[PDB]
Symmetry: C2
Subunit: 451 residues, 2 copies
């Protein structure tokens, strides 16, 4: 008996390169993840996004599936290279027509489209001349944003600039396990500021084209960091990780300035005075309408002093938080969701929130009876949705929840070895099969109540 | 060269009883202002809203005027008694059809409708059994909200629950110069909480009917209070007026609780423990999408005891005319009050978007023998105050739109028709609308997003 507020948005989320496939069709140039997944030893078993879920060709069936699950909204990504090849020049209408048809198919079924402009699929041609480390990429993102907004502004009421820039910046250029695969602390931090500048400049473009009732937003995988103990050394660890992992986004975007402590922690690795130019923070800190929160597992840190995606805090040790583990070996702790929601409520009482991603990977299999039983995923969702309910009851302004994912997916460096979707996908045949969680989540989206 | 942000909403604002007229047509029961204006000595010269600007019959011409002015949005009020006579029972479709047509006419011209559910026109039948002093009125406002939202939710992307509840509560039941005309400090404060409860209950209904992209809001005439000096007595005066005039709304709606200092200042005049029941503040403090700000003139106060009031518990506070030019209302012209008010809400609530839902000035407008209505003082006023919004925006204020009061000359409540706020002159003898010099100036602003 967990009744949610009236008008609470129930949706599911996907990503362009993760479901679409058709990487080379209709003029789509390769993205940085096309080059990455096609590099030996960068993705498990050499899996690539060439085919993935073949959503480019099967989107009409998937939208009908979304309707069967009583989804109120659907969150997707727009492929930069598919709409604007190379990252410069005019757009290919053939690529734009796919997203035009997808949106129209969603509106016909009564589903609210939620578009993510960038979701780690940078055009390889742009990475070839600097990527997010160079200052021209935010200018290319602005022009690309104008293209998509002009085409879909009339129909899409929710627009997200960036999805999890922490991974794009640090996993892409710091530890090198994602996006282009570079390993350089200075590069990772230049990406941070240029991702912020891209988001900012992207908001300015959106405001000048989309209707005023539409909501702009950015989606952040905000790490919910608990210290291993109350010792001041462990508290500084939590602070360091929060400074370089979270407040490099929350700071400039919401407060209009980088926190002085993260400038100190990383000052030796990058020259902030030449990186941040006059006018950048005014651009980055444009008013936004909504904050997208991605949560999966808490972060447990301690003072480790006795290639890293945390520049300046390599001495911080990380630990597996207690509780059950998903197939990702991630801790299952719904309190982290509550804490993360309450933090933003306490620190930013006027900023509405939506859980743009939340899910879990498990060893899903088709039984000889044709059933895919995932009670652990139901348990996970029931747990974490209680946290949202409890946060809501305690004053948190949570407007929507999006399950990751709608389909089994190309889980980046894990390839297809990890299944997050509520709908099973047999990649051999592309058959869609609803899991036990799909029936459970459909009742939630239909009744606005937790069974 | 005051270039405004992209997507800045430019609009004008009106009120139901002030322009519409047709008070008794199509089944509209009398409102509290119908009874009030028809009471001898309550409105100047006995003016009533029976006819007003006759907008009920001339709305199509007015919408064409809005298009001529390059308006991006239009803010209006919905008459409670016209949609739902008596305040209970089913709605009259004939009344709903007017607002359906108005919205459709606006959408055809590409103008964004902004609907104010309540704008001081309480059904007289509801006042007859307590009005805002009794607890049933907020429940009647909920049902009334459900009617309008169901009918217009698909088309209206901006919804305001209440417009200036300070006047409804204090001018209506405290000093008795407005709404039903009662004079009782306890009544005024019971209205405060029940207006808050009505706003709250109204938001819950809106959320269950409107699309998620629609924006809910409340409009507050937040008094921008400066103390006459730094003396602690003058600072307490400023504090008292801010507690009973402003933070009785900002508190419960945004912070979820009434401030203890206003509970102390007024505790002797009303029993808050009997007034506020379990669940009221949860209702009142529903998340909001936008704050509507009405500003006209600053408030200059001092402790008068040191060399019928609409401020219960602070009757000892003296009020003074702030320096600067004066409008026809003899209100101080000080654009700094707008900036300060915007910056305050920015500092105290950094995440709440704002819109100036009302801002204007009254002046002695006249038609020259050449047929011209020259109001350079209104242009000066608007140019000044729009600069304040510009600087606030530049200093980080999240201001989303600006609405000029008013589109037309109107029935200005107790002042009758003696005060002209509109950018478009209205000759009430013939009901002809004639654009003033400021209308041409404001049309350029709304078209270019730049101040000439």
């Amino acid at each position: 008996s967990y009744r949610f507020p009236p008008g609470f948005v129930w949706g599911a989320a996907t990503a362009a390169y993760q479901i679409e496939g058709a990487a080379a069709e209709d003029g789509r140039t390769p993205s940085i993840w096309d080059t990455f997944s096609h590099t030996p030893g960068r993705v498990l078993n050499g899996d690539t996004g060439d085919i993935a879920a073949d959503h480019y060709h099967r989107f009409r069936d998937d939208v009908a599936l979304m309707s069967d699950l009583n989804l109120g909204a659907y969150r997707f990504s727009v492929s930069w290279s598919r709409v604007q090849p190379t990252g410069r020049g005019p757009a290919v209408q053939r690529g734009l027509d796919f997203y035009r048809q997808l949106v129209d198919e969603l509106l016909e079924k009564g589903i609210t489209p939620v578009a993510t402009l960038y979701h780690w699929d940078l055009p390889q041609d742009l990475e070839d001349v600097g990527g997010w480390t160079v200052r021209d990429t935010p200018e290319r993102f602005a022009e690309y944003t104008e293209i998509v907004a002009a085409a879909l502004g009339d129909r899409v009421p929710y627009w997200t600039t960036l999805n999890e820039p922490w991974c794009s910046a640090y996993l892409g250029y710091g530890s090198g396990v994602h996006a282009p695969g570079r390993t350089d602390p200075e590069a990772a931090l230049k990406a941070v500021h240029h991702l912020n500048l891209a988001h900012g400049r992207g908001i300015g473009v959106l405001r000048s084209l989309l209707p005023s009732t539409a909501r702009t937003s950015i989606t952040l995988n905000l790490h919910q960091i608990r210290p291993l103990s109350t010792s001041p050394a462990d508290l500084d660890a939590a602070r360091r990780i929060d400074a370089v992992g979270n407040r490099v986004w929350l700071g400039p975007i919401l407060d209009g300035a980088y926190p002085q402590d993260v400038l100190a922690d990383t000052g030796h690795l990058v020259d902030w005075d030449r990186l941040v130019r006059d006018g950048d923070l005014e651009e980055i800190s444009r008013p936004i309408d909504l904050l997208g929160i991605n949560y999966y597992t808490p972060t447990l840190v301690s003072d480790g002093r006795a290639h890293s995606p945390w520049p300046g805090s390599e001495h911080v040790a990380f630990h597996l938080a207690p509780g059950e583990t998903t197939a990702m070996r991630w801790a299952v702790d719904a309190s982290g969701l509550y804490d993360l929601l309450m933090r933003i409520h306490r620190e930013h009482p006027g900023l509405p929130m939506m859980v743009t991603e939340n899910g879990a990977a498990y060893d899903d299999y088709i039984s000889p009876e044709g059933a895919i039983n995932d009670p652990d995923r139901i348990a996970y969702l029931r747990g974490h949705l209680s946290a949202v309910h409890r946060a809501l009851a305690d004053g948190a302004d949570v407007r929507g929840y999006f399950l990751w994912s709608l389909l089994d997916n190309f889980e980046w460096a894990y390839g297809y070895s990890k299944r997050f979707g509520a709908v099973y996908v047999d990649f051999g045949t592309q058959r869609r099969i609803p899991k036990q969680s799909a029936h459970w989540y459909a009742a939630v989206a239909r009744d606005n109540v937790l069974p």
